[PDB]
Amino acid sequence: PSPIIKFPGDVAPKTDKELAVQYLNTFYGCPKESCNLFVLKDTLKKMQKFFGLPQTGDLDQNTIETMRKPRCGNPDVANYNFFPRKPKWDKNQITYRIIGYTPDLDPETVDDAFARAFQVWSDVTPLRFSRIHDGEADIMINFGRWEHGDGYPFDGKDGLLAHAFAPGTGVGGDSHFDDDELWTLGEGQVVRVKYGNADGEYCKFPFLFNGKEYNSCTDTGRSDGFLWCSTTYNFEKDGKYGFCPHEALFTMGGNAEGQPCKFPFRFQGTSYDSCTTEGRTDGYRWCGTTEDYDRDKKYGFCPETAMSTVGGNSEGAPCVFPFTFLGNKYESCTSAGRSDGKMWCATTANYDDDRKWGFCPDQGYSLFLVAAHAFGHAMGLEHSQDPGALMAPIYTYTKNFRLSQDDIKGIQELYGASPLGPVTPEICKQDIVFDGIAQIRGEIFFFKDRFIWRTVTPRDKPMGPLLVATFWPELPEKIDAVYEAPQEEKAVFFAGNEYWIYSASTLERGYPKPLTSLGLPPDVQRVDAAFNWSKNKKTYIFAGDKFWRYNEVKKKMDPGFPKLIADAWNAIPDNLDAVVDLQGGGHSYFFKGAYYLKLENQSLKSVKFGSIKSDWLGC
Ligand SMILES: [Ca+2]
Ligand SMILES: [Ca+2]
Ligand SMILES: [Ca+2]
Ligand SMILES: [Cl-]
Ligand code: NA
Ligand SMILES: [Zn+2]
Ligand SMILES: [Zn+2]
Structure with missing residues (x-):
């Protein structure tokens, strides 16, 4: 079942054309006036070129999927966007001021994210940033909305996340983050508990209370309307919680003694229906705790606000x-x-x-990452075309962030070394060994370290590289193997002693588990190969000189394994890295080093030779 409906007061979606034009207009320069068929194709291609798509004026199922991903607000073409044409701070000791804050995080958390983000650059250069609280700074940081005052309108949730201006005078170096986003640490709403035995900690979402998991703070269980969350998942057992901040319930410091804002509250010539930063320099939200703040002068601060619902009515x-x-x-x-x-x-x-x-609430976007990237703009850097580069336009959540060589290169190209960075694979121009190779929802997926190439047919150049985190963020730095499950069409990824099951980009619940759960002897803490068989539907997991079979129907292993790679297969080297059996053509190819071996389904002598780079990838 699933009927479609329109929800009262929802923002109608932009159609592909509408989307394209806006993208092209925003990031490519095609003027709002010139967009026509001719301009759409040509300009389109320039975008496609930048992102690795085929050069075509047509809007490709992937050209749209690409321009549908949240990204930075800065254009990809022409460093001619209000900053100084000389792309480089003329000083080595830079200052910054946080002018705006976001209500999604407590200031300490917001300050720290920014600093951590600057550190991204201090580490590989001689640039040292200092935070000033008054007057103009080299880099002013704010949070704003659609039209924030410098002429580069943001458009609400998702889509553009932030924009920073190049080193220069006035608006130069200045970093802006879209206030309609929800700024999490990258992995979900971040809330900092207010009182109780968990006063310093963050809520832990989800957490289980009475039979329900909560993915935001709740007054469930309470009588006094206060919000709360626990630090840990198991509230019943661990039992640590605190109150989540909300100015309708309470406020911090000021003279109101923790009482709630009073909405509206008259300040001078205005009635405020929310906390403001009017009257203030620190950027702290505040509010009268009584309806006439002048008349009674009772105020409290509003450092953070736990969210439950976004948009809708x-x-x-x-x-x-x-x-x-x-x-x-x-x-x-x-x-x-x-x-x-x-x-x-x-x-x-x-x-x-x-x-x-x-x-x-959704996963949000890390202010940390978004900051570190924007800050690269502020140092004079521009957008890289390297999928593994921080200064790539598109946003990708990376539990473990590492500045890529390409980034270090440029920043060191502008400034020093310091008082050497990760590299990114090129398939055709370098012979490399893939970590795992496998067909997924009908596409061939070639993995390596932090990236993956994919294609719908092996007689065409491979699409990529693409950071795998943009599909499987919970996965670690490298996988050990990959596969599909015949019953649910789900992807099963192996790494060290754990494995993950996904279904369409959604990480399975209960995952990851130790391989023991697949029914593998506790001795192995790695498996180097995997794949399913169309004839038998039996999943073999190869490790070292042995392999095993998995029953996807029975969800158990088969009668007394393991077997040997040579004892069960005639020509197969042990410690081989991948196996792939495309659906619909009885042939099983086993990969090792840079070159593979094939096989007919009905016979193991059944073979014909080949190599991966040349035979497999259009190279
Ligand atoms: Ca400035
Ligand atoms: Ca936005
Ligand atoms: Ca492998
Ligand atoms: Cl594999
Ligand atoms: Na595989
Ligand atoms: Zn950018
Ligand atoms: Zn701006």
């Missing part, structure tokens, strides 16, 4: 569980009715009766 009201939507009960956010996979929930017990809903 409920104005951030919390979800209600269980909630009934189209005659079915939902106890968690779903995408019923939305064709865009975005997750929402009702904010009342019944959507059918009330039609009130809202989007639930």
Whole structure:
């Protein structure tokens, strides 16, 4: 089941053309006036060129999927965007001022992310940044909205994340982050607990209380309307919590003694319906705690605000569980009715009766990463075309961030070495050994260290490189093997002693687990090969000089393994790295070093030779 519907007060989506033009207009220069068929193709191609697509004026199923990914606000072409044409700070000791904050994080967390982000650059150069609290700084950092005042409009949630100006005078070096995003540490809403036995810690989302997991703070269980979360998943066992900040419930310092803001509250000539930074330089939100702040002068600060709902019509009201939507009960956010996979929930017990809903918090974007990238702009750097480079336009979450050679190169190209960076694979121009090679949802996927190449047919150049984190962020630095499960069409990734199962970019719940869960002897803590067989549907996991079989139907291994690579296969070298059996052509190819071996399904002598780079990749 799944009927589609339009939700009351939702932002209609932009159609591909509308999207294209905006992308081309925003990042490529094609003027709003010149967009026509001719300009769309040509300019299109320039974008396609930059991102590795085929050069064509047509809007490719991937050309659209690419210009649909959140990215930086800066263009890809012509460093002629309001900064000094000489791309490089003329000093080596730079200052910055945080002018704006975001309500999604506590200042300490926001300050730290920025500093960590500057450190990204101090580490590989002689640039040293210092934070000043008054007057103009080299790099001013703010958070704003659509039109933030320098003439480069942001457009709400997702899409453009931030934009920084090149080193120069006035607006030069200045970094802006879109306030309509939700700034998490990259992995989900970040909230910093307010009081109790977890006063310093972050909420732990999800956390399990009474039978329900919470993915935002709740007043469930409470009587006094206060919000809370635990530090750990198991609240029942660990039992540590604190109150989540919200100025409707309480406020910090000031003279109001923790009481809630009073909304609206008259400040001088204005009535404020939220905290403001008016009257202030530190950028701290604040609010009168009584309706006439002048008359009573009772104020408290609003350092952080826990969110529950974003957009929709409920104005951030919390979800209600269980909630009934189209005659079915939902106890968690779903995408019923939305064709865009975005997750929402009702904010009342019944959507059918009330039609009130809202989007639930998503993974957000790390301010850290986004900052570090924007800050590269501020040092004079420009957009790299290297998928593994921080200064690539598109945003990709990377649990473990490492500045890439390409980045270090440029920053050191502008400034010193310091008082040597990761590199990125090129398939055709270098003979390399893939970590795992396997067909996925009908596409061949070639993995390596931090990147993956993919294709729908082996008689064409391979699409990529692409950082694998943009599909499988929870996966580690390198996989050991890959595979597909015949029953659910799910991807199963191996690495060290764990394995992950995904289904369409969604990390399986319960994953990762130790390989023992697959039914492998505790001795192995690695497996170097994997794949399924169309005839038998039996999954063989190769490690060293032995292999095993997995029953996907029975979810158990088969009668007493392992077997040998030579004892069960005639010509197969042990410690070989990959295996792939494309669907629909009885041939099983086993890869080792840079060159592979084939096989007919009905016979092991069944072979014909070849090599990976030449035979496999259009090279
Ligand atoms: Ca400045
Ligand atoms: Ca945005
Ligand atoms: Ca392997
Ligand atoms: Cl493999
Ligand atoms: Na494989
Ligand atoms: Zn950028
Ligand atoms: Zn701006």
